[PDB]
């Protein structure tokens, strides 16, 4: 809508206080106007239509029960646009500032978010399983990172290439997460998933066989579900990436850490100059061990590390 930026003031689903950008026109619309073409957030009113409508408030005060994941998916679309300007200088996920739209309120107890081809979309949760799952910096991220990814390297969302999909995701969501610097782990969606559990969380990267993963190629899922596992699979390339950041020994193959700017800084370049749509897990490695090679150097510890990573979990 065309009208003047505001600075809107809520509470998103954990309770946080936080303002927002919005824009007056008659009412306080939730469409950012300072990053690229803007943000804008929709409300999906318990219904799938897409995208529903832009999100209304007649004060500019965001408090109620209703309002929390739209401040929220709102909010964080923010800071995952402002990581990938300030740490990558991509703008936006098509690095020409395209709109950024979320819808939230999507259906009745759905128990969970995804990038839909075009926008972002985010159940409420049962209660039980999910809280509303825009309260999740590292779920708003990852749905954004599906968006770069499809256009970059637009890896097909099946077996292998799909399990990357997912991986880049989650390393991109967790790189989110440590950016914002509120309370950050790798871990997947513990602020959202099983209010009445404390401490578990959908994946872990660190150990991804935590939640029933693979840790290893040699445990790769080759069966048909989940578009051949593509949310099991990236366990393996999850750990790699972990190892590549913080180190560790893992079979017995020891990995020298190089933190996760150095990780974020290959990952986002295999990701925009290597990878394809029908990469395979060897591919990969083949895109990381050529991506730091670029940034650091052949005989660097960076591209060690890399193929340490790798050959820890069985990748070739
Ligand atoms: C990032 C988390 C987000 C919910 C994502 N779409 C996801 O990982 N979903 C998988 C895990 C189950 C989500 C709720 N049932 C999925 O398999 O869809
Ligand atoms: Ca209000
Ligand atoms: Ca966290
Ligand atoms: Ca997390
Ligand atoms: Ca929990
Ligand atoms: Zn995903």
């Given at each position: 809508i065309t009208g003047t930026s505001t600075v809107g003031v809520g509470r998103g689903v954990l309770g946080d206080q936080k303002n927002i950008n919005t824009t007056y026109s008659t009412y306080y619309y939730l469409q950012d106007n300072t990053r690229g073409n803007?943000?804008?957030?929709?409300?999906?009113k318990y219904r799938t239509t897409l995208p529903g409508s832009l999100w209304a408030d007649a004060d500019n005060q965001f408090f109620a029960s209703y309002d929390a994941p739209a401040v929220d998916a709102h909010?964080?679309?923010?800071?995952?646009?402002?990581?990938?300007?300030?740490?990558?200088?991509?703008?936006?996920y098509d690095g020409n500032n395209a709109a950024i739209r979320s819808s939230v309120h999507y259906s009745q107890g759905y128990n969970n978010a995804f990038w839909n081809g075009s926008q972002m979309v985010y159940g409420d949760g049962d209660g039980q399983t999910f809280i509303p799952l825009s309260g999740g910096i590292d779920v708003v991220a990852h749905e954004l990172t599906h968006a770069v990814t499809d256009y970059t390297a637009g890896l097909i969302y099946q077996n292998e290439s799909g399990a990357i999909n997912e991986a880049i995701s989650?390393?991109?969501?967790?790189?989110?997460?440590?950016?914002?610097?509120?309370?950050?782990?790798?871990e997947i969606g513990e602020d959202v998933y099983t209010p009445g559990i404390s401490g578990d969380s959908l994946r872990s990267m660190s150990d991804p066989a935590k939640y029933g993963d693979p840790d290893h190629y040699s445990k790769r899922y080759t069966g048909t579900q989940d578009n051949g596992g593509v949310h099991i699979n990236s366990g393996?390339?999850?750990?790699?990436?972990?190892?590549?950041?913080?180190?560790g020994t893992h079979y017995g193959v020891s990995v020298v850490g190089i933190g996760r700017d150095k990780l974020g800084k290959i990952f986002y370049?295999?990701?925009?100059?290597?990878?394809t749509p029908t990469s395979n897990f060897s591919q990969?490695?083949?895109?990381?061990?050529?991506?730091?090679?670029?940034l650091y150097g052949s005989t660097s510890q960076e591209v060690?590390?890399?193929?340490?990573?790798?050959?820890?979990?069985?990748?070739?």
């Open positions: 803007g943000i804008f957030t929709y409300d999906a909010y964080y679309a923010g800071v995952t646009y402002d990581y990938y300007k300030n740490v990558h200088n991509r703008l936006s989650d390393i991109f969501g967790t790189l989110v997460e440590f950016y914002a610097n509120k309370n950050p782990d790798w393996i390339i999850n750990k790699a990436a972990y190892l590549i950041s913080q180190g370049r295999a990701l925009t100059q290597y990878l990969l490695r083949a895109a990381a061990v050529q991506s730091a090679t670029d060690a590390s890399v193929k340490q990573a790798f050959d820890a979990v069985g990748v070739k």
